[PDB]
Design a protein around this ligand. Structure first.
Ligand SMILES: Nc1ncnc2c1ncn2[C@@H]1O[C@H](COP(=O)(O)OP(=O)(O)OP(=O)(O)O)[C@@H](O)[C@H]1O
Ligand SMILES: Nc1ncnc2c1ncn2[C@@H]1O[C@H](COP(=O)(O)OP(=O)(O)OP(=O)(O)O)[C@@H](O)[C@H]1O
Ligand SMILES: [Mg+2]
Ligand SMILES: [Mg+2]
Lengths: 408, 394
């Protein structure tokens, strides 16, 4: 079913570059204000549709830079929220600051502000650059969602619900617009604890009851992805379940049916639900580790590039210096010169220059490691040649450099 | 805890693993194979033990000749190949297998270059790996670590059993820690080849023992006794029950039990640890984020490296001005004549060069008579023109 590269970006380097670029963007002179601890606000909303569907208030999301640690965060703003009870913020925030989960966007702070020209309620989240909602990704008007992708989503939401429910809390909001893809097939709940504050007090439903609602909302989320119609527009659930049954396996239809069902005399628990998707959970555990290996591979390659870069800088500092006289032309530095030629002045038998990057990187790594491998250094007149090991070259190399450190 | 799969010092860890990968021993008695060279022994202790495969087993780090990559070679000493059909068939079945908790096998071949008839299995190479035996048997194992191992072994068994195969070998000496709390089965398909003509038991029967061997592995870690020396399973089960929760004791008992009259399947076992599997799904992903964080910080190192290498290849076959620029950046000298080695200046100048900034610098020849006022934009132009001239020649 699923591919090994399930959690793997196609081009990790560009992806990181684009995300870094998106993280640093600022608007020099915007009408947006500066908060006591936040500045350089940048809107992330593609469309400023004054919509109140999710929280009963219009909501904006800003990328902002914190003043204390200088890191970037996502600020969720509820326009027009008037603080009547400070306890709503303190109690909800006290419960959610504990939560740390790979499938939930962390909340750090909740506060009210007047800097926007009104009474606004601000929620400060982790920032995930170039994130798009499941709504934006799958429902935006122009294809069918692969079943393995849905199972991936199910396992990640299940992961979130395990942590949330175990802490005597509920994921009040499971709408597609409030679940973001922070990377390929990687989803996180983007709006936790907001409904906890908005519905504080006036709510009468208990925790367990709210948790029962999480499963229904969970089931409607899957149904939306399978049918392509948003949850709020699902008029005929039986008709949707039957659409799902024709496109997907019986296993998926059974899971969604268990999530939607409220007529059984048994209370639904995340414990029971996980037991039923154990096989899928193991598969995406595997895929996560394989992607970990992929990231470790690239990370190891770039850390070594860092080491090589510092070696190349030292090399450039040593050779052809200005100024003992002819210091770079005599003794050890002369061999270092021929080594440079061997690595960076490679030429084919025909006489054409060879610019293979691989030969160059391999040689510099062997130099740092001081490998007991021999190479043939050829003089520029080439009448004379020298056989040296990388271990020996490293010795000359370190000795030539620390002479300059002596001179300070 | 959240940092379950996260090394304490990733920097030091990667450096050591890099050194271990490139290391060679100049003159050992070890031979050169048709497609392998620079063999390096990985056996920590050279005690000749034949318990696992009935033959002494050696592991070498070797460099492939076709591709320049490093691999782990498992050598079975004194094994003479009797059936040619056995090797190919076991291979085509395991060549498919790709799993995060199993060391990939690539090739199987016989050799006489070692001074005897040896059977060689070529694996992926995981530098500075240690076995569970070396790690745990050479304090009490936290229960969280054991569930971690169980999920990874369970993961491995799902893929193996689904391919109508069995993990013949689950001993602690053939399960390696390739990183913190990260285990992989190091010896798959070896017993498949050795016992090909002799084994009469079916696939399903072999799979039932895997669960027993799995259960014996866990009991060993909880009690501190090697599987081969577990004389009293009931007493060990009671020890485990006194040190650990009832959940673990239940899992181990299910793995060991063969009296239930019910065929054990990996499907059923996975169902019973569904919650544990979810926790470690989370932990793998949080480590995913951790590695991505460091990678983002390190990603520019490649570009910086190529800029310096580019500079080194153009010079010493417009070139004159580039020479003063190199001098300006890497040959700074104090008023006394002493060399200045500030790293910040070097990085800044190469960064401005790459960016082609319109900022001007004053280049002076060592003879004070000639000077050049140039911008980094102009220097980048020459820098690029000088290079693509060499690409032309190639
Ligand atoms: N933590 C975050 N980091 C980065 N981007 C985020 C984060 N949370 C949300 N976003 C992005 O901000 C944008 C706006 O999100 P929002 O929830 O407002 O969606 P919306 O389409 O405006 O829905 P609504 O109509 O309910 O406001 C989305 O593209 C989303 O991916
Ligand atoms: N695929 C691999 N990549 C890297 N290192 C490995 C690999 N497989 C095994 N090793 C390492 O090689 C060493 C040899 O262990 P091996 O199990 O072959 O013998 P042993 O445990 O020393 O003794 P015995 O042969 O009695 O088991 C171990 O330290 C192990 O971590
Ligand atoms: Mg919005
Ligand atoms: Mg050995």
């Amino acid at each position: 079913r699923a591919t090994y590269d399930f959690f793997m970006p196609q081009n990790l380097r560009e992806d990181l570059q684009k995300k870094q670029f998106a993280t640093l963007q600022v608007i020099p002179n915007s009408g947006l204000p500066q908060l006591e601890h936040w500045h350089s606000l940048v809107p992330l909303d593609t469309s400023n549709r004054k919509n109140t569907s999710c929280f009963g208030y219009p909501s904006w999301v800003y990328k902002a830079q914190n003043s204390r640690n200088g890191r970037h965060y996502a600020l969720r703003r509820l326009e027009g929220y008037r603080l009547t009870n400070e306890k709503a913020i303190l109690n909800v925030m006290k419960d959610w600051k504990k939560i740390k989960n790979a499938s939930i966007v962390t909340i750090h702070e909740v506060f009210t502000t007047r800097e926007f020209g009104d009474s606004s309620l601000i929620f400060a989240y982790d920032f995930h650059p170039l994130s798009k909602t499941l709504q934006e990704h799958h429902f935006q008007p122009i294809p069918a969602v692969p079943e393995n992708t849905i199972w991936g989503y199910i396992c990640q939401i299940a992961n979130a619900l395990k942590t949330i429910h175990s802490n005597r809390l509920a994921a009040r909001c499971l709408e597609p617009s409030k679940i973001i893809l922070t990377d390929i097939n990687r989803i996180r709940l983007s709006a936790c604890a907001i409904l906890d504050v908005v519905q504080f007090g006036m709510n009468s439903r208990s925790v367990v009851e709210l948790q029962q609602e999480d499963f229904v909302k969970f089931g409607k989320l899957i149904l939306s992805l399978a049918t392509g119609t948003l949850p709020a527009h699902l008029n005929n659930i039986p008709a949707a379940l039957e659409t799902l049954g024709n496109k997907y396996s019986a296993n998926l239809k059974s899971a969604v049916n268990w999530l939607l069902d409220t007529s059984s005399g048994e209370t639904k628990t995340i414990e029971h639900f996980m037991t039923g998707i154990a096989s899928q959970m193991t598969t995406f555990f595997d895929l996560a580790l394989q992607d970990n290996d992929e990231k470790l591979f690239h990370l190891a390659r770039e850390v070594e590039n860092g080491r090589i870069a510092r070696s190349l800088m030292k090399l450039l500092t040593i050779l052809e210096r200005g100024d003992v006289p002819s210091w770079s032309e005599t003794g050890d530095r002369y061999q270092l010169k021929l080594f440079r030629d061997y690595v960076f002045h490679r030429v084919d038998a025909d006489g054409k220059p060879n610019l293979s990057i691989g030969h160059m990187l391999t040689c510099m790594s062997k130099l740092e490691a001081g490998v007991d491998e021999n190479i043939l250094l050829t003089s520029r007149d080439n009448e004379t040649v020298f056989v040296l090991s990388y271990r020996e070259l490293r010795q000359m190399y370190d000795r030539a450099f620390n002479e300059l450190v002596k001179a300070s």
